[PDB]
Each structure stands twice: as structure tokens, then as C-alpha cells.
Assembly symmetry: D3
Homo-oligomer: 139 residues x 6
């Protein structure tokens, strides 16, 4: 079944939003089939955000993303990738609608609480980057 990748970023964790975010996914009827708290290495950060590497905000981005623990997770359901990205809302929380996670919880565009894969191909890449294969459980 369709799967997507989510990460609750260091601001989300630091501000005590792990449970609220997870509850929104659960209530939506999505299955968590992998999850863990981790500390992302600078290498893994640069690899993950490779696309932004020539941007003037790149090191600030990697300092933020590596500045404390995150929660990484894999979520399974009908239309998972698309549905979780509507749930999460526009990248810039100032433009994200109320009812979305970024709309209800974010203010800055950089520290925007959470990440969700933007496409099925990004989900495969993102899952493989953050999880060993055995960290995936089935239920």
C-alpha cells in the first residue's frame, strides 16, 4: 500500500508537538509502520537537502535540522503521499491554511515544524535514506 515519509523537525520536538502531530495522522486512519527519534548527522542533512546546497540559507538550514532530535516516520494508507502533504500544508506557514499542521503550529519558513515527502519517488528515496529495511514493521 502507498507509503510516505515524515519528519518532525527539531522545533516540533523541542516545542512538545510530537503527540499532537502523531494524533492527527492516527485520527486520519493512517498506519505508522516505522518510527523513531534520531539525531540527523550533518552528512545525512546535506544529502537530504542537496537540492538547496547553493542557496545562501543552506548552512543555516543544516544547522537547524541537526540542532536537536527529530522524529522520523513512515506512514501507510490510501493516497498517503498526497494526503499527508495536504495535511501538512504550504511550506511557508504564513500561507498554510488553518487546520493544516503548519497552519496551526508554524510561523517561520525555515523552522516549519515538519516535513513530508513531496512525491512517491521522494518517499522511496527519503525512506531508504533514513531507515534500514528492518525498521519497517507490518500490521
Amino acid at each position: 500500500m502507498e507509503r510516505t515519509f515524515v519528519m518532525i523537525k527539531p522545533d516540533g520536538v523541542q516545542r512538545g508537538l510530537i503527540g499532537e502531530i502523531i494524533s492527527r495522522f492516527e485520527r486520519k486512519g493512517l498506519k505508522i509502520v516505522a518510527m523513531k527519534m534520531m539525531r540527523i548527522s550533518r552528512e545525512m542533512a546535506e544529502k537530504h537537502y542537496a537540492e538547496h546546497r547553493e542557496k545562501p540559507f543552506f548552512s543555516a538550514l543544516v544547522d537547524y535540522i541537526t540542532s536537536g532530535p527529530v522524529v522520523a516516520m513512515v506512514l501507510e494508507g490510501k493516497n498517503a503521499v498526497e494526503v499527508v502533504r495536504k495535511m501538512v500544508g504550504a511550506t511557508n506557514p504564513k500561507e498554510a491554511a488553518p487546520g493544516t499542521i503548519r497552519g496551526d503550529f508554524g510561523l517561520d519558513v525555515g523552522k516549519n515544524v515538519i516535513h513530508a515527502s513531496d512525491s512517491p519517488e521522494s518517499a522511496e528515496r527519503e525512506i531508504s535514506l533514513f531507515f534500514k529495511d528492518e525498521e519497517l514493521v507490518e500490521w
Copy 2:
């Protein structure tokens, strides 16, 4: 700070209670320093419960906890072991006070949603069982 061990049991996971349980801890000021979803081997359940081997329905206790994915976690905070034990409440959810996780959520002693270490020495044993040291995160 003190650390303690918590496990959200297969029933807690299956009933969609992971976020609600976690928000209770976050709202309490507790810090998640390690967390993952996993599937506990019969072998590992048997070790966790080794003191129950010669008691009634030992193999049922192990069935309950190996029957689906659990969320294992480590929580840090002032008085954690005792605070967490009070928040989870009595083993039997009918006797657990309202306001506890087992009072508010649990069905019966077997389907009681969650476990938490009962002593600091239990916590040390239970954390070593479930987590390599590298899966712990300082924040």
C-alpha cells in the same frame, strides 16, 4: 535527570493512542530521549517478563506483547520513574484512577495499553534490554 522506560503496547498502537499518550508526557515536561516502533520477539518478551515465568498464564503475557508493533521509549525528567508510574496508573484499568492513562484508556489487565518501569533498577534493566546506547539522544 532520571530516566524511565515506557512501552506503548500493541493494543495502544492498534487503537490509535500513540499521540495522546505522547502529548500527555510532553505536557508534563518529560523529554523523549529515545523512541522507536518495533515488534518484540518472543525471546525478548520472555526476558522482559523473566520474573513472571513461573506464574499463571505466563505465555499469555508474552502473547499480548508480541501480537503487534509496540512503541518503545525512554523519558527523562525530574522524578521520571515515579511521575510516569503515577501517570500510567494501576495495572488493572478498572482500579486505575480517572486521569491516568490506564484509567482513561485501558480495557482490562491484559489489554492495558502501556507499560512503565516500576523502579529505577527496573528502568536501567528495561532500557538496556530495548535500546543500544547509540539510540539514546542528548537534548
Copy 3:
């Protein structure tokens, strides 16, 4: 399973507490097997409280419960009668523990939001009073 009887009183209805009360039961794993909104006739209130006829302010007790629409329901689950009685709490909401429905919501003994059967024999009597057998649903 055990069944018990609950009534959300006119104050509970008027103050917009029906969902919150019901979510507490659902989160507890309780099954609603019958439910309706109704307006209790003085005659029927008098029967429900017949054991209070010779006590002080009998007619005030009946006023409280006939003064608006109530939600009547039947809940099924392990230990229901006792679990439900503990979740509703002490008759007097000032003495009801925080975490109970009456502790968290009730104003005074008359305006105490909710009733629940106090014994399995009370439950049987109170269910027969309020519901024909056809309004019960097996799920």
C-alpha cells in the same frame, strides 16, 4: 458483556457537553449499544427516582431532569457498571475527583451533568424503563 445506563442531564445537553462525555466513553473502549435524545415526562422521572419520593426536595430532583432534553444511553464493556460509575465520579461535583466527568464539569449536586447506574440491578431497571428492546443494537 456488562451493560450500564447513562443519562446526560439537561444541563449537560444545554452546556454543549454531549461529545466530550461521549469521547470519554469511546476512548475508554466502551460500546454505545443504544442512544437517543429525549424529553422525560414527569411521570417517568418520578418512576426513575421512586426510591427518593419520601426524601427532601423530591419534586426538585424531578424538575432538574424534566427541564430540558437529555441524552439517554446504554454502554457495554468489561466492568461497565463500575468503570462508568468511577468515570462519572461522586454525586457532589465538588467532592468528585478531577479527571471524572462530574469533577471536571459539574456545578453542584443538582447541576451534576450526568447520571450512571449504580449497580447491575439498577442498570437492568433503568435500561428497561428508558428503552424498548428493539432500540438496542448488537455490534
Copy 4:
């Protein structure tokens, strides 16, 4: 005053969402003037969904709608029909905005948690189908 019909469908009930949905209506300032849990007969199901009878999903639709208890209710307020349909969100939960009931709680298009009348004329028909006249209370 304006009235509309709502039904929480068997998935909504089975998943323990009755209280959350009712609370959203209460908080919105709408009055519940009738409500009950019922089991919908196959006859009543076919009558209600008559419009879809030549569609290849028709019997699946009626099997689902009759597969467990629902909650039927009548809701009263300024613009009730239109307001409750915005609250409920697009039929296909994948297209329903976050903050709506279907957006926060549904995934499938068939099992989409809840139903609300789509027009004032549909409300009259739907109310008359599901409720006897005496099941309507005023407050």
C-alpha cells in the same frame, strides 16, 4: 429555524468518532434536536441511496451502510444545511480540506465517515425517512 440531517456512518461509529463529531457541532453553536443510534435496514438503505442504484458500487454501498450501527441526528441553526456541509467537507476525503470532518478523519470515498443533507429539500426528505415526528425535541 433551519434544520439539517446528519448521519455518522458505521466506520465513524466503529472507529470511536461519535464524540469528536458531535463536539464539533456543539462548539459550532448548533442545536441537536433529535438524535439516536440505529441500525439501518437494507430497505431503508436502498431507499436512501436510490439515486445510485444502477451504479456498480451500489450493493457494496448498501452492505457498508447496513454493516453496523449509525448515529442519526437532526441539527438546527442559522444556515444549518450549508454550514454543516462545509463542516463535513468534500465527499472524497482525499479532496476534503484539513479542518473538515472528512478531511481530518476519512480516507476512502465510500467509507467517508459521515453524511450531511446536501440541500434543504434533501433535509426534509432525509429527516422524514429516518425520524418519526415525535423523536424531535424542542429547546
Copy 5:
């Protein structure tokens, strides 16, 4: 940093929504730097709604706004004025999206729960009208 003015109107207060509304702001990451419950004089009401004074609903508007206590507050954050007005939703709660405050809590256009400055210039004027300068705290 950017600041905006909010008032929870007498309907919001009377209906017990102060905490829910404040929590939405807190969760959003906005700072409350002034707040208080007050009773707005008819003079202050007319001054504040001066723009509507030749409208046939003007005295009804001032009777409502002065009919019980309000909560006035000042909120600070990145894009505060714009962000709080998206949060609050369209003036007419019937057109306000679910997830907004007016969308989740209002029905009438006059009694629409809450007010937020519509522009930075309106915020300065509104702050100065309702707060003495010393009622502003910094943190």
C-alpha cells in the same frame, strides 16, 4: 516585532471559549504581551466601530459589544497581523473555512466570536485605544 490586537467578544466569553482561542494562538507560537478582561464603555464602543455609525445595525452592534465582558489582547510574532487574520477567518462565519476560529465557533455575522486588527495601522490604533502603554509586558 510585529504586533496585532485581538478581542474575544462577549459571545466568546459567555460561551466559555477563552481558553480554546488562547490555546490556538499559543500553539501557533505567538506571544501574548498584553491581555485583560474588560467591560467596553459605549463611548469606547462607538469610537472603535465609528466606521459603521450610519449603518442600520450600529446600535445593535454597540449593544452587543457592551453587553458583557470581553478579553482584549496583544499578540506578537512574525507576520502577526496577517497570520492572526487568517486564523480568525472571514467576518461572516458562514463563509469562514473550518479550522478557522470563526469557522469552527461562529454562526452569526454580528456575533462572530472574535475580532482581529485588519491592518498594521489598525493594530496601532486599536492597541492605543484599548491599552495604556504600561499594560504591555516584554518576554
Copy 6:
């Protein structure tokens, strides 16, 4: 009715708990008759705690309460002083029952989120200290 005094402490404010605390009071049927955010002078803290002057770490108690903005309020309702004291719970949040504000939220005795008057004579003293009579509102 009885009135009592509550203060949300700097930690409660800083941790974003003002709404959650207030909703607990509103859901209980308590009426806020005065409220403001303020910064307490050392002088005024010293008066509030004057009975603690000759006890250990007096100056630490005053540090905790002058270290940021607090929300001061007055609450009115049947049994308010006692009901509010039970809802806040034991001074020490580790001993406070789950379901109380200090049980559910407090870190330790110093960082215990909130204060409430312990007697009607304390309430009268504490209300006069914190509020001129004009800041009280009849509703």
C-alpha cells in the same frame, strides 16, 4: 458567589499553558471576573509571600514569580475556593493527582505552573493585592 484568586506562573505562561488552564476553568462552569497579564515587582511578590519571609529560600520563591509575566485572575462560582484548589492539586506536582493542573503539567515545587488561594480569607487578601476594584467585572 464565592470568588478565588489564581495566578498562572511565569513557567505556565512561558510554556504556552494559559488556554489549557483557562479551558479547564471554563469547562468547570467557573466565571472569570477579572484577568490580566502582568509582571509582578519584587516588592509585590514579597508582600504576597510575606508569611514565607523567615523560611528557607524565601528569595528563590520570589525569584520564581518575578522572572517573567504571569496571568492574574479572579474566578467566581459555587465553592470556588475549594473547587479551584482541588483542580490545581498538591503543591508538589509529583504528589499532585493526575487530572489536576499541577499533576498533569507541573515539573517540581518551584516550577509548579499555577497558584490558587488556599482559603476564602487568603482569596480576599490576594484579590485586593492584585486588583483595584474597578478591574472587577459583573457578569
